[PDB]
Amino acid sequence: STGSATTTPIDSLDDAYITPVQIGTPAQTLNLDFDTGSSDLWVFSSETTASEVDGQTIYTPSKSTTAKLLSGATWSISYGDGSSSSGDVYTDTVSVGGLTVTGQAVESAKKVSSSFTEDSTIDGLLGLAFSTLNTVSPTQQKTFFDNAKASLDSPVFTADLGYHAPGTYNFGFIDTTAYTGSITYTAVSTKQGFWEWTSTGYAVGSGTFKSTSIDGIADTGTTLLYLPATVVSAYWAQVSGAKSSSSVGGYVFPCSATLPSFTFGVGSARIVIPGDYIDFGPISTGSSSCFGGIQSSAGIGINIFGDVALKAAFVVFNGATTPTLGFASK
Numbered sequence: 001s002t003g004s005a006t007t008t009p010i011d012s013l014d015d016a017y018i019t020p021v022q023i024g025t026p027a028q029t030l031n032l033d034f035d036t037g038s039s040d041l042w043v044f045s046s047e048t049t050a051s052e053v054d055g056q057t058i059y060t061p062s063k064s065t066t067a068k069l070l071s072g073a074t075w076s077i078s079y080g081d082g083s084s085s086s087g088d089v090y091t092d093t094v095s096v097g098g099l100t101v102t103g104q105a106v107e108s109a110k111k112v113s114s115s116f117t118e119d120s121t122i123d124g125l126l127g128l129a130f131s132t133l134n135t136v137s138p139t140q141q142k143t144f145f146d147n148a149k150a151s152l153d154s155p156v157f158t159a160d161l162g163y164h165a166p167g168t169y170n171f172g173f174i175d176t177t178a179y180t181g182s183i184t185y186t187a188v189s190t191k192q193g194f195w196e197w198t199s200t201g202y203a204v205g206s207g208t209f210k211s212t213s214i215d216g217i218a219d220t221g222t223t224l225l226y227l228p229a230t231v232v233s234a235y236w237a238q239v240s241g242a243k244s245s246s247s248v249g250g251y252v253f254p255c256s257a258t259l260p261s262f263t264f265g266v267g268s269a270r271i272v273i274p275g276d277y278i279d280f281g282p283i284s285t286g287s288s289s290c291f292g293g294i295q296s297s298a299g300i301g302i303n304i305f306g307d308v309a310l311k312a313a314f315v316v317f318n319g320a321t322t323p324t325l326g327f328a329s330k
């Protein structure tokens, strides 16, 4: 089997991407944020504290003839950015782009943090990291991909995120029309539960490429590119007037600037992030200070190849017995 679904930016800045997911019988379609940096499939629901729902579409398990309470199971997750959610668990039928899994754990939120409430466009998350990170207790559950994998034509999924435009998540096949050149594969460590890999270096604009190992995660659920402070300083030094603002929480730059590109290495291959991808717009409405899309990972403990990087590539998440990651230009 295979599946193929369009993923759509939630706003004009590509802050996140939502993908429609069918849950239950008859189907209830929710728009979920596919997150290769976490491993829980959770949704706003008929159980979510009413004051914490503001415009989201909810899953109502009592209206699904295939829903079953997973007795005694609870979940609770904290994200790297401080947001959180928690609740109880059903199993139900879940379909993405024509690919169906029966008995998928659907984590129903009883509580969500304010950042989730405040984003009416995201109805929940669909985790695509390794199932070792799943938070369901006392019996840890599998991701959608892990449940689907044996049925897929090939044990892979691909992320093809657009810049200011829709893109695609495919399951079970590689669309050879969706990228240029060849796909370069690179080793993955699953030790921390992530799609963790090592970039071979970087360049800023038309500058010379610096060979250096940068260990980080391929994370579709993180907006920005978080890299070591040395790399990030070298980037922003090429933008007149850019500075790190402790009050804003990262590098800002004049909105009148034209940003240089940023290149990262994948083995001997190179992925170029155009400068425009690195502009996240005014820090507040009407300001002429704009927020940068490349930020330091120094406070985080891990480098993160988030959407800013991934949307410059066609990315293969290869879930073979020894997982690997592939990147192609597009």
Ligand SMILES: O=C(CCNCc1ccccc1)Nc1scc(-c2ccccc2)c1C(=O)NCc1ccccc1
Pocket: 015, 016, 033, 035, 037, 079, 080, 081, 082, 083, 119, 219, 221, 222, 223, 224, 300, 302, 304
């Ligand atoms: O990049 C983001 C925000 C993603 N949503 C963007 C958005 C912006 C405006 C409006 C609506 C949505 N957070 C970061 S920054 C760094 C991390 C992180 C990830 C893993 C480990 C450590 C830190 C994260 C992070 O925790 N990402 C997972 C996540 C996914 C969705 C919601 C909440 C957390």
